[PDB]
Ligand binder design. Structure first.
Ligand SMILES: *Cc1cc2c(cc1C)nc1c(=O)[nH]c(=O)nc-1n2C[C@H](O)[C@H](O)[C@H](O)COP(=O)(O)OP(=O)(O)OC[C@H]1O[C@@H](n2cnc3c(N)ncnc32)[C@H](O)[C@@H]1O
Ligand SMILES: CCCCCCCCCCCCCCCCCC(=O)OC[C@H](COP(=O)(O)OCCN)OC(=O)CCCCCCCCCCCCCCCCC
Ligand code: HEM
Ligand SMILES: CCCCCCCCCCCO[C@@H]1O[C@H](CO)[C@@H](O[C@H]2O[C@H](CO)[C@@H](O)[C@H](O)[C@H]2O)[C@H](O)[C@H]1O
Ligand SMILES: CC(C)=CCC/C(C)=C/CC/C(C)=C/Cc1c(O)c2ccccc2oc1=O
Ligand SMILES: O=C(O)/C=C(\O)C(=O)O
Ligand code: SF4
Ligand code: F3S
Ligand code: FES
Ligand SMILES: [K+]
Ligand SMILES: [K+]
Lengths: 102, 239, 139, 611
């Protein structure tokens, strides 16, 4: 829209807040629904957040295009691997619990 | 005698190949006014009349003498000299600015960004301009307190890392607070258009709430809070 | 007789081709606690993301699965104090970024902008980060 | 050795305070291609430091009438004001203040939503018979700050070409007509001639001839001096206003709004001494009378502080919410510069050089005038407005809140008169190819000066000389010594010493130019004071205590022998300086008593003046 920048700022805040609610959810109702919500929310929030770092620190049309393109690849591979881990392995919530039992 | 040392940034554009340096001066505090500007004027009048800086009002209203004193951006004319004689006061130009000479920065981008927000009253029907005073209630005028008092010294904006890295496209806290001053003026009819001008990734949204702006303001204003109010208006306004 | 856009353009054109130096900034500016905490929020956020991406890469690339690596780790019979350090180090940036994230979400509502409250809320973020981290590293 | 850059405009305004801003965009708004040349960025001008407000008979607090404001100003000026200019100013005042509010000036407000107005020194209802007037419109106690920021913001809507941080050196004169100005671009050290059909001088005052003043460091009489170097007269420069309440120490202004809101002046013995000096007006008498009163209390042993050298402004009996809403600016300033909490303790204050009543003489239309063989003659192409002009709306004493009004009224007047007199695009007049050459010779001379007396030391000798010889009360012997000391300091400028040999941002040089300018204003001021053998407004001669008019207006005029023009003092001083020698010549021209319309607003004959 013509309000693209304000909608993005609002969406960033909504995803932060969702991710904040997933932390109590993971501890209280761990399971596949949480595991994939964390997969989606963790990838989206970090993709948006890393994009702000790129916007602040990277200058020039080509370096900007390269950083943002590398970031999409990083984010797309990140989300796939997290979904991979949730489907073929123990999933995020169980992994954390297993790590903490060490 | 109470000798105090100042270490002041020096650069001469009329010396070819001159490199920026610090120069130390010694000032007897018993023969000097209490403010840092008093020491700068005393040095210029008595020790080194090549030392160059901006100044006018000497009372913190004009905004001319903004500079970095002891790590913080302030006005030299209201900044008390530190009477601990074991410490040297370092004095720099406003940070991340092109230096014209010594402590004189180039503020013309900062001024051009203020021009770009149209910092003046705008009415949809301006044909009545001059006939009668516009009516503004005491309460709606109170909304301007903390906003209209800005002297445009650039202390806040030159303290903001977001303005350091992206000062070409980010308006910075001085200009953004003045944008909000006109957005909430009840007599102004262009609130939506003023919000619409900040619908891009840089003009407003490089603010990440660092809050150096509000710490540094020699008028005790809160440009950080004014920016947060813009953001809330940005996400709520309809067309 | 010059628009603002023309004025900004002439500024950059004049200055970038000049011999004028750029005045110092980060190397000379005085730090405060809010300023230090603002950049640590960015640093812990980037660190958490790079940790998530590495984890995600290992799930795709390592030939064994997670329970094997947990078993391998336990087989080393590490000291409880060293386990406690590793847990504290893992949870500390998450705890910091989370509590400070909440502080950011409060600012985004327009609350807590008085400079004395920025300082109160930051010190509050620090003690909760410590308390929650030590409580969780004990788990 | 100096690359000269030549420009062509319809009009050039020198100065970007309140008057120059209003003239400059007013000219552009009439279709004139206009340059505004200013030594400071515009919002840094001394106008930004103004506090108490701006007078206009809007009638928002009571029923008002601009003719009462007219009368107050005429009586205020002690009958050295030109009543035609005062008519224009006071009748134009409502429309001018309304113009400012419509630009967006954030005036304090009343319960009806209208502009809040306070009481202020020497203003009354019913032609001096109706009690205290409340017509000083204000933005808290920061009116000048908002006035200037609003005028600057409004000026961004127009095609005015700004030349910021350029220092005007001289006018370009030819055959008695101004052809433009010559200036130094401080940012890059180059010389600029601005050719134009009309030139407007709005450069402010010269409070910095004194050792203690409320004025900015940049109030150096620069346009005044250029006029003197052009061989033109200045007017009434002996008439310097001491504001009753500069803060002790730094000299910072504490607004008369404090007394207008209820504050009172007290001496060492807790007396509200103004009740004795001016039983009706009290602490809201005229500034010349309040300042003389305070000065008497100190020299008669009732000074406050450890040195017995100031008095107190008391505000703490006033409700703290009133201080926060009406006087927030001076509440901060009293803390920073005095460590005073205004809710608990009084502000140490003394009379301090504040405002120059005289200036470049003009008519009511802003046109600069000379005076030749008993006749006023407009100087073609040359206008002045604001504190640098002598219209003269202030005469021997300016009422508080009338200067900011003068700025916007006469800044616009200059624009309106050019528009009714000239058209845009008329062929800008040529100058000789070497015009302005002597201004550059002087600049190069100072830039390389290598004598015995550095600039800061010569300036200090001028300021302490003016301070102790041309103060609130004066006498002939002391003025004569000030004249002799000042002329010597002027000659000793041949021994000047500077150190900065650069040309980019050489404030060592720019302050040596300002010194030359202050010196020309100060020579005219003190030599005019010595010659004026009477007491009128701010000029008090303890060897000539009476006001000397063409009649004795204390008794009926029936049967009085009118005094010849050379035997009385109700006349403007016209001062000229031979810039090489420093010799001051003085002439006189009549005060204008006719208004613009006798049926609409009677000329006010002179009278005993008492508050
Ligand atoms: C000193 C003062 C005066 C004052 C006041 C408070 C203080 C501290 N409060 C006032 C008030 O509440 N009500 C009121 O009516 N008057 C008040 N005053 C007096 C009044 O402010 C001044 O007389 C008035 O503001 C002067 O205005 P003006 O527009 O004439 O001039 P300025 O603001 O001093 O600006 C001078 C401009 O001229 C430019 N300039 C000067 N020299 C040069 C050269 N050589 N070349 C180019 N430009 C020059 C300056 O840059 C400035 O822009
Ligand atoms: C970073 C590493 C993650 C830090 C998380 C710390 C929390 C660890 C924890 O104590 O969880 C325990 C919980 C229950 O397990 P247990 O302690 O055995 O208690 C049994 C009785 N309730 O186990 C659970 O139910 C898990 C609930 C929490 C899930 C948290 C999910 C978000 C993790 C995002 C971390 C991103 C950073 C990655 C960095 C490391 C990469 C190398
Ligand atoms: C797991 C998490 C990861 C991997 C992560 C990562 C990030 C990253 C990389 C950023 C960008 C940093 C910046 O722009 O300075 C960021 C920003 C942010 N995060 Fe997180 N984060 C996590 C959890 C949380 C939680 C639980 C909250 C609550 C939260 C709130 C925020 C906020 C409010 C911002 C924006 C700060 C600003 O606007 O300047 N985050 N996060
Ligand atoms: C994960 C943890 C990340 C944060 C921890 C990193 C360490 C932080 C180091 C920086 C702290 O630096 C310190 O901050 C404090 C509080 O703002 C500053 O103190 C500030 O507030 C005090 C009290 O109102 C004022 O007197 C003082 O003028 C001001 O500088 C101090 O000058 C600065 O030197
Ligand atoms: C990863 C961060 C590396 C980097 C380019 C940091 C720049 C910078 C900031 O933007 C910043 C933000 C808030 C407070 C202090 C800051 O100081 C910095 O070094
Ligand atoms: O000069 C004036 O008109 C008024 C002041 O200086 C004042 O604010 O007291
Ligand atoms: S908000 Fe404060 S620091 Fe920033 S420009 Fe205005 S007065 Fe100066
Ligand atoms: S310091 Fe800069 S990031 Fe925002 S809160 Fe202030 S403008
Ligand atoms: S000289 Fe005006 S703000 Fe310092
Ligand atoms: K509005
Ligand atoms: K004047």
């Amino acid at each position: 829209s013509s309000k693209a920048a304000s909608l993005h700022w609002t969406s960033e805040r909504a995803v932060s807040a969702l991710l904040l609610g997933l932390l109590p959810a993971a501890y209280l109702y761990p399971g596949p629904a949480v595991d994939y919500s964390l997969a989606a929310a963790l990838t989206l929030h970090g993709h948006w957040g890393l994009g702000q770092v790129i916007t602040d620190y990277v200058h020039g049309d080509t370096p900007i295009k390269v950083a943002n393109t590398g970031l999409y690849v990083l984010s797309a591979i990140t989300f796939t691997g997290l979904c991979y881990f949730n489907y073929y392995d123990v999933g995020i919530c169980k992994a954390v619990a297993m790590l903490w039992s060490i | 005698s109470r000798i105090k040392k100042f270490s002041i940034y020096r650069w001469d554009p009329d010396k070819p190949g001159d490199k920026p340096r610090m120069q130390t001066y010694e000032v007897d505090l018993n023969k000097c006014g209490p403010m840092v500007l008093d020491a700068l004027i005393k040095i210029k009048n008595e020790l080194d009349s090549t030392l160059t800086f901006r100044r006018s009002c000497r009372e913190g209203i004009c905004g001319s003498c903004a500079m970095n004193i002891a790590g913080g951006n302030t006005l030299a004319c209201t900044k008390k000299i530190d009477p601990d004689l074991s410490k040297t006061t370092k004095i720099y130009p406003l940070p991340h600015m092109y230096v014209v000479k010594d402590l004189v920065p180039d503020l013309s981008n900062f001024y051009a960004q203020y021009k770009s927000i149209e910092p003046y009253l705008k009415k949809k029907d301006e044909s009545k301009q001059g006939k009668e005073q516009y009516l503004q209630s005491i309460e709606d005028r109170q909304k301007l307190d903390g906003l209209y008092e800005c002297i445009l010294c650039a202390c806040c904006s030159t303290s903001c890392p977001s303005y350091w890295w992206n000062g070409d496209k980010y308006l910075g806290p001085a200009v953004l607070m003045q944008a909000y001053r006109w957005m909430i003026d009840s007599r102004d009819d262009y609130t939506e258009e003023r919000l619409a001008q900040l619908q891009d990734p840089f003009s407003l949204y490089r603010c990440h709430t660092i809050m150096n702006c509000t710490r540094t303001c020699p008028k005790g204003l809160n440009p950080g809070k004014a920016i947060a109010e813009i953001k809330k208006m940005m996400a709520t306004y309809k067309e | 007789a010059t628009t603002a856009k023309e004025e900004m353009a002439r500024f950059w054109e004049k200055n970038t081709k000049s011999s004028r130096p750029l005045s110092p900034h980060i190397s000379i500016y005085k730090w405060s606690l809010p300023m230090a905490m603002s950049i640590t929020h960015r640093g812990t956020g980037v660190a958490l993301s790079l940790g998530v991406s590495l984890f995600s890469l290992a799930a795709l690339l390592l030939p064994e699965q997670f329970p094997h690596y947990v078993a391998v780790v336990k087989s080393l019979s590490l000291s409880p104090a060293l386990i406690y350090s590793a847990k504290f180090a893992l949870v500390f940036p998450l705890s910091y970024h989370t509590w400070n994230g909440i502080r950011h979400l409060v600012w985004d509502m327009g609350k807590g902008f008085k400079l004395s409250q920025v300082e109160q809320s930051g010190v509050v973020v620090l003690i909760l980060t410590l308390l929650s981290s030590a409580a969780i590293a004990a788990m | 050795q100096y690359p000269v850059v030549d420009h062509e405009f319809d009009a050039v305004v020198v100065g970007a305070g309140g008057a120059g801003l209003r003239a400059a965009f007013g000219l552009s708004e009439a279709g004139f291609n206009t340059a505004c040349v200013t030594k400071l960025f515009p919002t840094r001008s001394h106008t930004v430091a103004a506090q108490g407000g701006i007078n206009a008979a809007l009638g928002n607090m009571e029923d008002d009438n601009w003719r009462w404001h007219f009368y107050d100003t005429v009586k205020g000026s002690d009958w050295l004001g030109d009543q035609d200019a005062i008519h224009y100013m006071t009748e134009q005042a409502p429309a001018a203040v309304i113009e400012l509010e419509n630009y967006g000036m954030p005036f304090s407000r009343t319960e009806e939503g209208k502009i809040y107005q306070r009481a202020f020194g020497g203003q009354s209802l019913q032609f001096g018979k109706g009690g205290q007037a409340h017509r000083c419109c204000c933005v808290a106690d920061r009116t000048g700050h908002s006035l200037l920021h609003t005028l600057y913001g409004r000026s961004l809507r127009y095609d005015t070409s700004y030349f910021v941080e350029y220092f005007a050196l001289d006018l370009l004169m030819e055959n008695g007509e101004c052809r433009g100005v010559i200036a130094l671009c401080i940012e890059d050290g180059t010389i600029h001639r601005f050719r134009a059909k009309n030139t407007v001088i709005a450069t402010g005052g010269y409070g910095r001839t004194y050792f203690s003043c409320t004025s900015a460091h940049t109030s150096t009489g620069d346009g005044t001096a250029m006029v003197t170097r052009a061989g033109l007269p200045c007017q009434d420069l002996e008439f310097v206003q001491f504001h009753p309440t500069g803060i002790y120490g730094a000299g910072c202004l504490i607004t008369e709004g404090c007394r207008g809101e209820g504050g009172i002046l007290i001496n060492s013995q807790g007396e509200r001494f103004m009740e004795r000096y001016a039983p009706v007006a009290k602490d809201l008498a005229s500034r010349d009378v309040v300042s003389r009163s305070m000065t008497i209390e100190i020299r008669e042993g009732r000074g406050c502080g450890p040195e017995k050298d100031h008095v107190y402004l008391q505000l703490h009996h006033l409700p703290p919410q009133q201080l926060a809403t009406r006087l927030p600016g001076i509440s901060e300033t009293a803390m920073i510069f005095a460590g005073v909490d205004v809710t608990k303790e009084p502000i140490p204050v003394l009379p301090t050089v504040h405002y120059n009543m005289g200036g470049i003489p003009t008519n009511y239309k802003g046109q600069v005038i000379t005076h030749v063989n008993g006749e006023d003659k407009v100087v073609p192409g040359l206008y002045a407005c604001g504190e640098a002009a002598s219209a003269s709306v202030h005469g021997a004493n300016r009422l508080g809140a009338n200067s900011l009004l003068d700025l916007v009224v006469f800044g616009r007047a200059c624009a309106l008169t050019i528009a009714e007199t000239c058209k845009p695009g008329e062929p800008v007049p040529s100058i000789k190819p070497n015009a302005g050459e002597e201004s550059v010779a002087n600049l190069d001379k100072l830039r390389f000066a290598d004598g015995t007396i550095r600039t800061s030391e010569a300036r200090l000798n001028m300021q302490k000389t003016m301070q102790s010889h041309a103060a609130v009360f004066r006498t002939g012997s002391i003025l004569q010594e000030g004249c002799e000391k000042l002329s010597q300091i002027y000659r000793d400028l041949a021994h000047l010493k500077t150190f900065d040999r650069g040309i980019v941002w050489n404030t060592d040089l720019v302050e040596t130019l300002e010194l030359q300018n202050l010196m020309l204003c100060a020579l005219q001021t003190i030599y005019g004071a010595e010659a004026r053998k009477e007491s009128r407004g701010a000029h008090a001669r303890e060897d000539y205590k009476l006001r000397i008019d063409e009649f004795d207006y204390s008794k009926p005029l029936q049967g009085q022998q009118k005094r010849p023009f050379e035997e009385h003092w109700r006349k403007h001083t016209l001062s000229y300086v031979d810039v090489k020698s420093g010799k001051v010549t003085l002439k006189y021209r009549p005060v204008i008593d006719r208004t613009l319309n006798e049926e609409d607003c009677s000329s006010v004959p002179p009278a005993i003046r008492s508050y």
